[PDB]
DNA sequence: TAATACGTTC
RNA sequence: UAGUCGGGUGAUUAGCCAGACUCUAACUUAUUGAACGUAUU
């Protein structure tokens, strides 16, 4: 069924479709990517084939995702994430390890079958074939481990869906004490104006993980951190200031200001120009005020001619 | 790259180094700089930009610790708690992580030390493996380096990775640096309880058995008699000069002519001795440490070596007296022993200092009070902070007398009925530094003034309460107990101070009840 | 058995 | 006291000026994939 569903929407044949199915798990292109600091980061990205089943078997198949959920969903963003917390003085950041390639074929069913909101029911033998669309194999030779990747279409919208109950249980014990949660992916915000009622988070997550998920799923302790407004409070590389507002934080500030100022004098090559526009409709999305201040100190003219 | 770039002109110091290694001068510079910059505060102290220390320290079923979470001060942090509460296997934790920096700095790719599979799991965690994870800091450009040592218990199906990059990304750029140009290198040291247990030198020599094995009297005593045969009694040229004229004269000049061959060799062996293990003269590396000594040891005022005798004899001004230093109880040669240690350590590792001894560094010390008597328990951490301004010293202690001279915020305690669940450790509520040491025993340590064990203790509360019983009146009990007291603390012991003033105290309400 | 308009986040 | 927040000034990621905050307590992150902003059309 699943196969003349994806056939019909890829105007192509049932036997094509299921053809390709069968090595697919091994069709994704692993390679890196450097990070910010020193290293790289490993991306599995499927093949465009690949990608276009993955596609149309989202747009196929509804999966419940809970309003906490605010990575890769319509219209919320990490503006939206920061915004929810910006009220609270109080803050606690937590973080689950491996957060994708820790969800496994066994957790999904587990999830579809444990899952109450309107889940679509799939006959046994497209269960095989859901697999093959949706897990990479990461070891060539041993078939038995398919993983979520990092870099498939698919994979986000899974990966909400396996969180469902996971957030429904956490937004309804938090509801109760006044705490404010979001979830951006792996990246779990606590906020509340209440002190210490912070502190007990952290238990009840490893719990609840340990419930849902056994050992698969878990917290990563060095990535938990508590934080008020004595401190920086950040959200999804948000920053969030003491009066309460969202803010680009001092030093991007300061930094768009610097290139606002190189290209003033013509110091700006076109990259680097390209860049600060950038940076100038970011600022735009995060703290228009920003905009308003630079537009007053710097000669509109001057800002026109940069968007341009 | 360009990202790279606006980083590391940022202030950087990861993406700065990346930039230099990929290429470059500038880069180096700013690199150079980061590790090399400071100031002189207003007491005169030498005091880095960016500072060097351990953050925080997450323990998770490591031995009796199911998860455990510490805040370390920068300069002291002090752990108590009774036998058994887990100090030694905090220290233990700390110095394991310890050993991956000092391994990268001696080495590309040196391999540090790790958790055992069959001692450090504890014992009934359910999910059979132990993680200890650290996070350092290093300035303003590098606030976080997370390390994590990890095992698994024998047997189990799945292994779990230790965490080490971020040790061996900071600690290469300590290696490839010194190795263009000197710099200033941190100093990582471990004093456990066996210190009290009874080639030519080069600079890493300062690592070898730092994280344990340091800390020895004889290594101690040997050294500095070396050291001195050499520092008792100018260019190569001149002195290749003066020795070819020596030479020429050569039978009473043959001594001398011995003493100059010597120099000129050790003067051609530094010449020739690369940048990244340059050193100051042994004159100079034996002055800072017969300072270090005499500042930091109680009542040791100098220290030197004679060979009057016909043997050669470490001596020491202790309390006013010239006495060998095996006359010094084993209590303080053990302590003397630790600091001339360090004080060798800081000194190889920190050339470029005026004084080597304000160098960076973190340095372990388990049981301080190991072998001191009382009077000497309250003088020891007085010293050390002043005699070392930017180690940050993580202690163990058991001694209230130790505690009365430190303030509250560097203490960490354990929770008496801690079974090992506890989450987070906390400061005392009591302020220490100053106090009483009968209140740090009860307030701090939960532990009673007076034994409760012995009989006698009781005897002014019972005396008390046959006072009150009688009406105030000195009956044929209350005497009896009373001549008790009195015969067992003496006339002129407070307990019977405190008896009398009972009796006095109640015969005056009495009378007044009286006057009714 | 990846993609290239520029930023941001996971 | 120290850290943190950031309105102004500065050929401007610095330095300096002003105001404010303080649960034991942020460490600014990742693309070509997904979402969001902007541009092209
Ligand atoms: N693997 C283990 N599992 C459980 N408890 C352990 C384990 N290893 C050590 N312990 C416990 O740890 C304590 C000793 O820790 P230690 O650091 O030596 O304490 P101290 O504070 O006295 O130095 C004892 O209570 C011992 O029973
Ligand atoms: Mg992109």
Redesign the pocket.
């Known amino acids: 069924s699943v196969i003349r569903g994806l056939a019909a929407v890829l105007r192509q044949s049932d036997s094509d479709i299921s053809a390709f199915l069968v090595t697919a798990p091994r069709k994704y292109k692993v390679y890196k990517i450097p990070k910010r600091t020193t290293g790289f980061r490993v991306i599995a990205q499927p093949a465009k084939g690949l990608k276009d089943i993955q596609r149309a078997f989202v747009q196929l198949y509804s999966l419940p995702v809970h309003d906490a959920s605010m990575a890769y969903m319509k219209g919320k963003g990490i503006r939206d994430n920061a915004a929810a917390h910006a009220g609270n003085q109080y803050l606690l950041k937590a973080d689950l390890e491996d957060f994708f390639n820790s969800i496994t074929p066994a957790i999904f069913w587990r999830c579809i079958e444990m899952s109450s909101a309107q889940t679509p029911q799939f006959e046994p033998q497209d269960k095989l074939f859901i697999e093959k669309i949706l897990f990479w194999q990461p070891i060539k030779r041993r078939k038995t481990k398919l993983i979520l990747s990092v870099g498939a279409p698919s994979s986000p919208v899974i990966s909400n869906f396996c969180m469902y109950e996971f957030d429904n249980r956490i937004h309804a014990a938090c509801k109760k004490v006044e705490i404010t949660y979001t979830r951006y992916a792996d990246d779990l915000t606590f906020s509340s104006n209440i002190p210490d009622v912070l502190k007990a988070v952290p238990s009840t997550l490893e719990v609840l993980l340990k419930d849902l998920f056994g050992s698969a799923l878990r917290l990563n302790h060095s990535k938990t951190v508590f934080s008020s407004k004595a401190h920086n409070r950040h959200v999804t590389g948000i920053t969030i200031n003491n009066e309460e507002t969202l803010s680009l934080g001092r030093d991007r500030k300061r930094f768009i200001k610097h290139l606002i100022n190189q290209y003033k004098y013509g110091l700006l090559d076109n990259e680097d120009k390209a860049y600060l526009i950038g940076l100038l409709a970011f600022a735009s999305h995060i703290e228009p005020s920003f905009i308003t201040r630079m537009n007053e100190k710097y000669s509109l003219e001057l800002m026109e001619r940069l968007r341009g | 790259t360009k990202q790279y770039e606006r980083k590391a002109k940022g202030g950087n110091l990861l993406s700065a180094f990346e930039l230099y290694q990929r290429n470059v001068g500038e880069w180096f510079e700013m690199c150079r700089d980061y590790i090399q910059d400071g100031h002189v505060d207003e007491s005169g102290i030498f005091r880095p930009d960016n500072a060097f220390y351990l953050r925080r320290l997450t323990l998770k079923d490591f031995?009796?610790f199911s998860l455990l979470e510490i805040k370390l001060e920068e300069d002291l942090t002090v752990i108590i708690?009774?036998?058994?509460?887990?100090?030694?296997?905090?220290l233990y934790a700390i110095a394991k992580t310890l050993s991956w920096f000092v391994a990268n700095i001696l080495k590309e790719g040196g391999s540090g030390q790790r958790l055992s599979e069959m001692?450090?799991?504890?014992?009934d965690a359910e999910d059979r493996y132990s993680d200890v994870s650290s996070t350092f800091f290093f300035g303003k450009g590098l606030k976080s380096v997370p390390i994590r040592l990890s095992r698994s218990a024998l047997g189990t199906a799945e292994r779990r990775d230790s965490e080490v990059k971020p040790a061996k990304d900071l600690a290469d750029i300590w290696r490839v640096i010194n190795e263009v140009n000197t710099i200033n290198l941190p100093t990582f040291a471990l004093y456990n309880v066996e210190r009290s247990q009874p080639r030519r030198e080069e600079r890493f020599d300062a690592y070898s058995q730092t994280l344990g094995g340091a800390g020895r009297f004889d290594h101690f005593v040997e050294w500095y008699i070396y050291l001195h045969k050499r520092t008792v009694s100018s260019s190569i040229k001149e002195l290749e000069q003066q020795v070819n004229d020596l030479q020429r004269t050569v039978v009473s000049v043959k001594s001398l002519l011995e003493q100059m061959k010597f120099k000129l060799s050790e003067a051609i062996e530094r010449n020739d001795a690369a940048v990244s293990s340059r050193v100051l003269t042994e004159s100079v590396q034996k002055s800072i440490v017969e300072k270090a000594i005499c500042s930091v040891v109680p009542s040791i005022s100098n220290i030197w070596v004679e060979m009057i005798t016909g043997s050669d004899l470490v001596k020491v001004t202790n309390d006013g007296h010239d006495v060998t230093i095996d006359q010094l109880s084993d209590g303080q040669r053990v302590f003397l022993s630790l600091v001339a240690d360090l004080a060798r350590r800081m000194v190889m590792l920190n050339p470029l200092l005026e004084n080597p001894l304000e160098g960076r560094g973190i340095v372990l010390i388990d049981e301080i009070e190991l072998h001191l008597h009382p009077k000497w328990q309250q003088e020891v951490i007085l010293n050390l902070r002043s005699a070392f301004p930017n180690i940050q010293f993580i202690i163990?202690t058991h001694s209230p007398i130790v505690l009365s001279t430190i303030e509250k915020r560097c203490i960490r305690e354990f929770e008496p009925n801690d079974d090992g669940d506890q989450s987070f450790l906390d400061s005392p509520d009591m302020q220490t530094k100053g106090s009483e040491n009968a209140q740090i025993l009860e307030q701090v340590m939960n532990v009673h003034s007076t034994p409760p064990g012995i009989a006698e203790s009781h005897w002014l509360g019972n005396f008390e309460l046959l006072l009150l019983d009688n009406s105030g009146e000195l009956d044929n009990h209350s005497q009896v107990l009373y001549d008790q007291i009195k015969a067992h603390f003496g006339i002129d012991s407070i307990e019977l101070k405190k008896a009398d003033s009972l009796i006095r105290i109640n015969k005056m309400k009495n009378k007044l009840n009286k006057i009714r």
């Open positions: 031995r009796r708690g009774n036998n058994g509460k887990g100090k030694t296997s905090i001692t450090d799991i504890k014992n163990t």
